[PDB]
């Protein structure tokens, strides 16, 4: 019906993938994930002649575009390395070769810069970059009535816990994708079953969340659950099991928040009234009268 832009935000973190390899029996699961992604992107390009593909990798020290390659490299180049065979379809083959060469360049760059260890994940920035690319292609409109779809291939691996600092950018990405009617799909290849922020992302942007534990057989997951072109989203149901509760985390305890209290200024969430009669995130003094109205106990006769 209508062509679409499939933007794959893939989180290739050496730390996370090394922990995934140590948790699993096999080694080098990055290769299996990468080749399943290659076959899935070839499948998406086989779906329609005019549809488009973008890939953004979120590595340790930032983000980098994998397909298409940087225009500075386009102007400078072409050393066509022979990782992908040249007898296959050429319209898939240039895409695949550009993707694997940029994978090789990214791994060589972070092998050079391997010494610096960072606790700052760039998945949110990569998703924001993918949303900007979606907006760019939609506003350019060289192909009329182009749909768009985000697919996020992340890995948890049981090593990195939930990150509080990612909450605001992922929420902003949710609102932007909902405004542009671009679904966000998330595949989490790891041990931790629950990823609340990306689950809320899928359920609010009308995407599919899929948590998997083994890198083997990933192409069937991608071609069955993740192959939903936005042409057929309202007529194809989604396999996103495990409905998310749309809750949040307390600012000073960290637990999931039941009936609770938020600051009226900076909208921070607290499950308890903070000590010092002052907002922790906002530094506002709170009125003793109204917080005593909060601290009152319910009434019952003796």
Stretch that binds another protein, among 145-153, 179-187, 192-200, 222-230 (CB under 8 A): 222-230
155 scored as a contact of another protein (CB under 8 A): no
Question: Would you say 122 and 62 are in contact if contact means Cβ atoms under 8 Å apart?
Answer: yes
Strands 52-59 and 269-270: unpaired
What does R_g of the chain's alpha carbons equal in angstroms? 22
The nearer residue to another protein, 71 or 117, going by C-beta atoms, is 117
Of the pair 89, 165, the CB lying nearest another protein is at 89
For the CA atoms of 212, 218, 222, 224, the dihedral, rounded to the nearest 10 degrees, stands at -90
Q: Exposed (0-12), middle (13-18) or buried (19+): which is 282, by Cβ within 10 Å?
A: middle
**Partners of 256 in the beta sheet?**
249
Q: Give yes or no for residue 285 binding another protein (CB under 8 A).
A: yes
Residue among 128, 117, 116 nearest 166 (CA): 128
- Please identify which residue in 10, 84, 170, 184 interacts with another protein, judged by CB under 8 A: 84
Minimum distance, C-beta of residue 49 to another protein, in the bound complex (Å): 5
Q: Which letter, b or e, does each residue of 69-91 get, where b requires 16 or more Cβ atoms within 10 Å of its Cβ?
A: beeeeeeeeeeeeeebeeeeeee
Nearest to 168 by CA among 179, 176, 180, 160: 176
Q: How far is the CB of 178 from another protein (least distance, A)?
A: 15
The answer to the question of residue 292 lying near another protein (CB under 8 A) is no
Candidate ranges 74-82, 156-164, 262-270, 286-294; the one touching Zn ion (CB under 5 A): 262-270
Q: If contact means CB under 5 to 8 A according to the sort of partner, which of Zn ion, another protein, none does residue 61 touch?
A: none
Site for another protein in 11-70 (CB under 8 A): 14-15, 17-19, 21-23, 27-28, 30-32, 34-36, 38-39, 42-43, 46-50
Question: What's the half-sphere exposure (Cβ side, CA atoms, 13 Å) at 19?
Answer: 15
Q: 18 vs 172, which CB is nearer to another protein?
A: 18
Residue of the chain from 78, 112, 139, 241 that contacts another protein (CB under 8 A): 241
Q: Does 258 bind another protein (CB under 8 A)?
A: yes
Smallest separation (angstroms) from another protein to the CB of 270: 7
Closest to 171 (Cα-Cα) out of 197, 192, 206:
197
Closest alpha carbon to 122 in 44, 34, 36, 61: 61
Site for another protein in 87-116 (CB under 8 A): 87-93, 96, 100, 103-104, 107-108, 111, 114-115
User: Which spans in 88-156 are helix H?
Assistant: 90-112, 123-140
**Member of 160, 172, 178, 248 binding another protein (CB under 8 A):** 248
Distances (CA, A) of 277 to 97, 221, 289: 60, 51, 11
Select the residue interacting with another protein from 223, 249, 280, 281 (CB under 8 A). 223
Residue from 114, 164, 256, 265 touching Zn ion (CB under 5 A): that is 265
The residue ranges that bind Zn ion (CB under 5 A) are 263, 265-266, 279, 282, 284
């Amino acid at each position: 019906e209508s062509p679409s832009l499939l933007t794959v935000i893939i989180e290739i973190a050496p730390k996370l993938w090394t922990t995934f390899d140590e948790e699993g029996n096999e080694k080098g699961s990055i290769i299996k994930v990468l080749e399943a992604l290659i076959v899935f992107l070839n499948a998406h390009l086989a779906f329609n002649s005019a549809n488009k593909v973008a890939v953004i990798a979120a590595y340790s020290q930032g983000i980098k575009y994998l397909y298409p390659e940087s225009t500075s490299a386009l102007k400078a180049s072409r050393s066509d390395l022979k990782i992908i065979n040249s007898d296959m379809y050429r319209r898939f083959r240039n895409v695949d070769e550009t993707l694997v060469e940029e994978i090789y360049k990214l791994f060589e760059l972070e092998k050079k810069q391997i010494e610096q260890n960072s606790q700052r994940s760039t998945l949110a920035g990569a998703m924001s970059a993918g949303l900007t690319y979606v907006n760019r292609i939609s506003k350019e409109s060289v192909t009329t009535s182009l749909k768009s779809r985000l697919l996020v291939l992340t890995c948890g691996s049981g090593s990195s816990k939930d990150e509080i600092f990612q909450y605001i950018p992922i929420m902003n990405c949710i609102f932007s994708a909902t405004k542009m009617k671009c679904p966000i799909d998330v595949v989490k290849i790891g041990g931790s079953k629950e990823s609340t922020f990306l689950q809320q992302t899928t359920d609010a942007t009308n995407g599919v969340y899929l948590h998997v534990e083994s890198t083997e057989g990933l192409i069937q997951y991608l071609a069955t659950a993740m192959f939903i072109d936005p042409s057929l989203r309202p007529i194809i149901v989604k396999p996103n099991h495990g409905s998310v509760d749309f809750r949040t985390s307390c600012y000073l305890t960290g637990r999931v928040v039941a009936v609770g209290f938020i600051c009226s200024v900076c909208l921070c969430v607290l499950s308890i009234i903070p000590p010092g009669n002052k907002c922790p995130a906002c530094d506002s003094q709170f009125d003793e009268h109204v917080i005593a109205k909060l601290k009152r106990k319910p009434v019952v006769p003796r």
